[model samples]
Target: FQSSAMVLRDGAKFEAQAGDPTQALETYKDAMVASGVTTTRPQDNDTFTRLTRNDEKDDWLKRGVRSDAADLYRQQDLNVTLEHDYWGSSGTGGYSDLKAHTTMLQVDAPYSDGRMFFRSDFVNMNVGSFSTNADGKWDDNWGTCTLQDCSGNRSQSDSGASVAVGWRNDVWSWDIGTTPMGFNVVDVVGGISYSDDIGPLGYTVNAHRRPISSSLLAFGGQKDSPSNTGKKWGGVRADGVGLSLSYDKGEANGVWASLSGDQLTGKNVEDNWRVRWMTGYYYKVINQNNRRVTIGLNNMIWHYDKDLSGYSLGQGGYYSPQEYLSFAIPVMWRERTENWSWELGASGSWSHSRTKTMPRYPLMNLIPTDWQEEAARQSNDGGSSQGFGYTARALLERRVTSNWFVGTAIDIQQAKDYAPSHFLLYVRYSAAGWQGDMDLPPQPLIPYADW
Candidate 1:
C-alpha cells in the first residue's frame, strides 16, 4: 500500500564508458588474429568479418530525471468539480521503486442548502482521490499482479473517487465526511502553541488528513493477500488521522511540534497504525526576499507497527520482482512474521523491526533468484518485509517567485530501508492509439484520476 522508494531523480545519471583509446584498436587486431584471418587470404571470412565490423565504442554520460505530474480542477464549493492526474512515487532515497498510473472522475452535487452534501468519484474512491499508484493488481488470471502486460511490456492502471459535505463560518470550519475524501496538511489546519507578548504567541494545532485509500491497498501489513488488495480497489474507506502544535511569534524562524497517526483497518478485522510525533524549528537564516536562506532542525521520534504480508507483484509490475527489503544487517523475526506466505510458490519470513517491534528491517522477498524460474511456478511469496520502523529528515527549500519552488532534503535516519529497484528507461506506447473510457470526459490519463 505504501511505497518504498522515490521514483524520481534530480537530473542525474549512472553510466559507464569504454576504457582505453589504444586498447580499442589493439582489441580489434587481436580479434582478427583469433578469427583465423591470414595476410595471404585478405578477402577470407576472418578478414572480412574483422575488417568490416563497425566500431562499438560509445561516449558521454547518458542520464535523466525521473519525473511526474498531477492534474485536478479545484472548485470553491463542495460539489460539481472534475479532477484527476498521474504522478511518480519517491519510494526510497536512491531507488525507483514504482511507476504507476491512476485516473478518477469526481462530480459533486449537493442538497439541504449546502449544509448537507454527498459526493463521489468514479475511480478508486476509498484511497486519497489524488493518490498515484505504486503497485499493481492481478490481471492475467493467475492471481499475480502486472504493472506491465503479461509479456512484461505495459503499465497497469487503477482509478476511483470520493466526496463529502464541508461547512465553514467566520473563524471556524468543519466537514462531516462519511464519504472518503482527500486530506493534506495544507487543509483544515489546527495546532497548539505558546508565545510571549512580544506580539503573537499561542499553542497552535494545524493538521492535514488525506483519506487516500483504494480497496487495492486497504489490506493490513506485509502478509495481507494481494487478492484482497485487488478486490478492494474502489470502495471508499478511511485511512487515519494527524495533528500538530507549536509555539512562537509566527516568524521566518519559529518552533513547532507535530503529531500524525493513521489507523488502517482491513482484512475482515485487521488494523494498521502509523503514530509519530516531532518537535523542531524552521529558521529563516538568510531572510532575504526571493534569494533567501534558512536552516533548522526537526527532531522526530515516531513508531510504525503493522503487518504487510500480501502476495502481490513487486513494487513495480511485471518488470520487477515481488518485494522484500534486505537488511544491511540481519534483523530478528517473530513467529507470526515467519508464517506469512503468498502465491508464486514463495513463502516469506521477516527480519526484526529495527524500530517498531525490534531492529532495522529491510524490505525483501525470498524467491528463486532467477526470473524465469520464479515466474514459472505458483510458489509462495517469500519476502523480508518491515513491521515497525522510524525515520528523521531535514528539508531545505528555495522558492522562485511564489508559485514555483524547489527543495532538497536528507533522510538522516531510517527506521527501515526498502529493497533497491532500478531506474527504468521509460518508453511510451503510442503505437496502439490511446483507447479508454471516451465517455468519461476528455482528461489526462493519470494515477490520481483512478480515485
Candidate 2:
C-alpha cells in the first residue's frame, strides 16, 4: 500500500488526465499538505506538477475577470417598474357601465441580502363619465333607469392620484397611503400583514383599510344637490381583517383558504357589513423544472348585511347581496426559459346570488325634507339569479438583457349580466443583473374593484 501523499499525488494525476483541471489543482494542493512540503526543490524534479498548477491557476484567473461596468452593477440591488392598466365593465343586471385607466410607477430598493427593503408606488386613475339614477326614483327599484328620467347624470370624468410607501422583511410588511385624492373625499388607506410558517404550512394575517370602487359614487363622493346644499353620499370604504393559510408539497399539490369580514361605511350612506370565505386546491398534472400544468377547484361565499347595491341617494353604488356563492374549475399552464416566461389560464364557474328587498332610502332620516316624500314612495324589490361564468387570462414576459424585462397581460370575465375585461403592459429594470426566468408581471397600484 502506498503512503497518503503518494495516493493523493496519483489521484491528482488521474484528475488531470480526466480533463478536470480545477479538481486536479485542488487535489495536488492536498497532496502537498499530506507530504508536509511547502516548496518543490530542483532535486525533487516535480516539473510536471508545477506546470499543471500554473495552467490551472491561469485558467481560473481568466474566468474570474469582469469588466468595470459589471462590477458596478453587482454592487447595487434596485428594481423599478412602470405599468399601465385598463379596466372596463359593461352595464348589466342593474350595474352601471364603468371604465378606469390607471398608470403606476413602482420602486424597490433592497439591502442586507434582501432581508430589508423599501418600496414605493405612485398611481393615477382616470374614471370615465357615467350616469346613475336620481334620488326620487324610488318606485323604479330595478335601477334600469327605464321608468322615467329622474335627473342625476354625472357627465364629467373623475381623475385622482394616490401614493403609498411600504417596508418589509422576512416576516412582517406594512404599507400606508391615501385613496385616490381626486375622489373628492380622500381618506386613509393602509395594510399590515405578518407571514410565518408552521411546519410545512404557511399562514398570513392582514388588516386593511381600502375604498370600494364599484362605481363613481362609491369611489368619488357625491352630493344630493349640485349647489352643495344637500348632504354628501357614497365614498364608501371598508375596514377589514383576514387570515389565510396555505400548504404545498414541492409544487406537486397545494391548498389554501381564507376568511374575511369588513365593516362598510360612507358619508351619509347606510352602514353595512360583509363576510366572505374562499378556498382552493390545486394539483400539478405535469410538474417539471421549467414547465408545469395545474388543475384546481375554487369556491367562494359572501354575505352582506344589506342589499344596498343601488344607485339612489343614501345607497352606496356597490354590489351588496344578501347571499352569494360560486364554484369554479380552473386550469393553468406555465413555462419559463432563459430569456422568456409565459402563463395561460382559464376557468369555468357557476354562481348563485340573492338580494332581499331593501328600502330605496336606506337612511331615510338623512335625506332632506324636500325629497322625503318621493324617496318613501318606492323600494328595491330584490330578486335572485343563478348562472354560469367563465374567465380567461394570458401573460407573457421577455428579458431583453440580464437587467431589463418587458411584459403584457390580458384578463377577461363574463357572466349573466356581468362582464369585465382588463389589460396591462409593463417594463421592469434591475440594477443588479439577474439570471433566470422572469416572474409574474407587477400589479398596478390601483387594483381592480372585483379582485
Candidate 3:
C-alpha cells in the first residue's frame, strides 16, 4: 500500500505527498520531532500506515486552484458618509451661525492584482440662512435686512464629482484624475507620483492641476453668487498647477512640505499660491500587553499669497488668513481583545494667524468683472491674531460576526478666539471584511477614512 501524511511545522500545518507510504511516514515523523510536537510512542505498523495518506495534491488542487488556475488576491471597497455641522461664529454681537450640510459617497474597486484600481466620490453641499440683526435674530425681509443678506428665500447648493484610475506598485505609483487635498486645496484634476525607499528614508515627487471653481469661491474667473461660501461674499478661482516633494519614514515621526503656485505663462492661473509644512513625532509614554498610551506633538505652518483664501466665512473681520501656524499635543489610548476594539484621543491646539489685511465682503451684486478690484479695495493692513482651541476625537468599532462590523466616531472642536465651535457625528458599517483580519488586535484607522 502507498500513502502519505500531514505534519505540523513552522507554527502551521504542512504535509508531504508521495507514492511510498513508508517514506512519507518517516518524513512526517522527523518533521513532528523537529517542531517539538508529540511523537513519543512508537506506533503500531498499521496505525502508522493509516496516518500516512498521499492526499496533499488533491487537497490543494481543490482549495488553491479553480478551473485549473491558481487563486490570486482580490479586494473591493464601497463607503458612504453624511455629515451636518455648524461653523458658528458666535455671531459676535450680531452674526449668523454659518450652518451647512455635506453629503459624500466614495467607492474603490481593485483588480485581482491589487495594483490597478478605480475610485470616485459624489459630493453635495448646501448653505442657507439669513444674517442676524443687532439682537441676533434672522430677519426674513431680504430688502430690509442688513449685513450681506441673501434672504429672499435665497438658498444655494453645489454638486460635484470626482474620479480616479491608478496603478500602485512596489517601486512607484501613478494616478490620473481628481483627488481631494486636505486643509486648503479642494481637488486636483490629474496627477502622478512615484516613490522609492532609499535605505531608511522614502521620497516622492508629484505634479497636478486643479480645475477652477464655478461656485462663489472663484475670483477673477467667472463664478455665480451662491451665498453658500462660509462667507456671504462671492469671488472667482483660476485653474492652477501644483508641484510637490515629500519625504517620509516607516515610523510615525516624519516630515513633509509642499508648495503650490499659479501658472506663469498660461492663459489660466490660480488666485492664490500656498506653502505648507508639517511634522510630528510620537512618544510611547506607556506600554502594556493589551493597552498603551502614546503622546505626539504635531505642528504645521500654512502660508498663503493673499488673505481671505479658500472657502471662507469671513465677514466684518470674521475669518481671514495670510499665514497660519498651529501646534497640537495629542494624547491617545487604545485597548483591544478578541472581536472588540476601542480608541480615544484628544488634542489641545494653539493657532496663530497673520492677515496683514482685512478681508473683503463682496455683496450679492458681486460680479466676475470687478471681483479682483473689490477684493483689492476691501483690503486694509492689520496686525496678527492668535487663538487657543481644543479638539476631542474618538472611535469605537466591533466585529459582530466573522464578517460583520459596526463603528462610530465623535469629533468636536472649539475655537473661540479665532473661529467657532463645530462638531461631527460619523457612523460606519461593514457587511464584509475589506480589512485583512477583523479578529486580530485593534489598529488605528486611516486618517482620511472619515472622508
Candidate 4:
C-alpha cells in the first residue's frame, strides 16, 4: 500500500500545428490551439496524443498504459508455489465486454532473499492494440499513413520460458541466468568484487560481470520492434563479458563505470568491445509521510571497440496494401488490452550508459525509420550506440490503505537501447530524445525525420 502518490503529465500535446503545411506534418499541439487535418488520425482518436489508433478508433473507446512489477518472496528454506502475471495495457471500450488478456506464470523456490535462489517462468501475451490496413492488417510501428480506407486492427500473442538464480551479500552479490536459453541466446553470468564503507557515507564498490550472447525480443527484423532472432549457442559459441563498478551515498549522489565486449566466437560475425560510465544524484525537497519531491541529473558515456552493425526497415519486405499482415509486420496486433493501457502511465529512470551524443543530433530520434525499424537494426555509428545506460524512478504516491493510489509525475530517464533489454532503456531514450533532439533544437533535423 502506498502512503502518498504524486503524478504529473505534460507530453500529450498534438503532433501537428496550425500554420505548417499538411505535407510537413507539423506535429505540434497546445490546449488553446486547433491542429488542422481532421482525417489524419483514426476516428477513435477525438483528442489523443500522437493519436495512435487502429480500425477500432472511436471517441468513447479510450486506451491506457501501465507497467507491472513483481518482487521475490521467501518463507522457510524450502518452498515451491505457482505465480501468475498480467502486464501490458487495456482499452476502456465503454462496455466491460471489450477487454483483452495476456497471461504469464512461474514456479520457483520459496520467497527468500537467500544466498541461492531460482525461478522458472513462462509468459504469453496478445496485447497493445494497433490500426490495420483495409484488407485486415495492423501497423506494428507508430504512424497514421495514407492508403484510403486501408486501415484495420492487429496485435500479438506468444509463449516463452526462463530460469534465473542469484545471491546477495554485504560486500558482494551476483546472479547466473538463462532464458528461452535455446538457440544461441542463453544468458550465462558470474562475477564478484570488494568495497567497504567510507564513514557516514555508507559506501561500497562492487564489480559485476555478465556474458549475454544472442538476441531475443518477441519477433525478429524491424526498426522499432524487438528482434527475436540471433544465436541460440547450443553448440555455436558467441558470448560477451561485462564488468561494472558502482557506489551510492546519502539520497542524492552516486556514480558507476563499466566495460564489456562481445567475443563473436561464431560464424559470420565481427567481434567487438564496449565501455561506458554513469553518475547521478537525487534531492528531496519535502520528505514527509513517505511522500517527497525530488530531482536529479544522470549521464553516460559508451565507447565501442569497432563500428557496430544494424539492420534496416523492411529488410525482407515492407508492409503493403496487397500483402497479408504477418507477411508485412513481424509482430501481431491484439484484439483487446488491459484497462490501464491508456490512462496516463508515466515512468522515470536514471541514465546508466556513457555514450556522448553528437553536437548536431545531441540525443537520438526519428533516425533511420522514425524508430519503426526495431525488428532488425540494433546499433548504428551514433553516440552510446553500443552499450551503457542506467535508470531509477522517483514516484510520489498517495495510497488509501487497501485501495489504489492516484497521482502524476514528471518522468525523466536516460538509458541506452536494446543492448540493455527492458523498456526503460529504449522507451526513455525516445522520450528524452524528443525533448533533447526535437523540442530543444533551434533548427530541426532533415525534413522527413522529425519524430
TM-score of each: 0.36, 0.75, 0.57, 0.37
Models ranked on lDDT: 2, 3, 1, 4
| lDDT (10s digit) by residue, model 4, range 175-240 | 555433332233343444544565544434444333221121211111222221222111112244
For each predicted model, how many residue pairs clash, with residues at least 3 apart or on different chains? 92, 0, 10, 84
Q: Candidate 2 has which clashing residue pairs, if any?
A: none
lDDT of 2 by residue, 22-42 (tens): 455566555545554434421
Question: Can you write out model 3's per-residue Cα lDDT over 279-301, one digit (the tens) per residue?
Answer: 66676666553466788887877
User: Which is the winner by lDDT between candidate 1 and candidate 2?
Assistant: 2
Model 1 local distance difference test score: 0.28
lDDT for each of the candidates? 0.28, 0.66, 0.41, 0.27
Scored against the true structure, residue 369 in model 2 reaches a CA lDDT of: 71
Estimate the overall C-alpha local distance difference test score of candidate 4.
Answer: 0.27
Q: By the lDDT metric, which is better: model 1 or model 3? A: 3
* Of 2 and 4, the candidate ranking higher by lDDT: 2
**Which structure among the candidates has the greatest lDDT?**
2
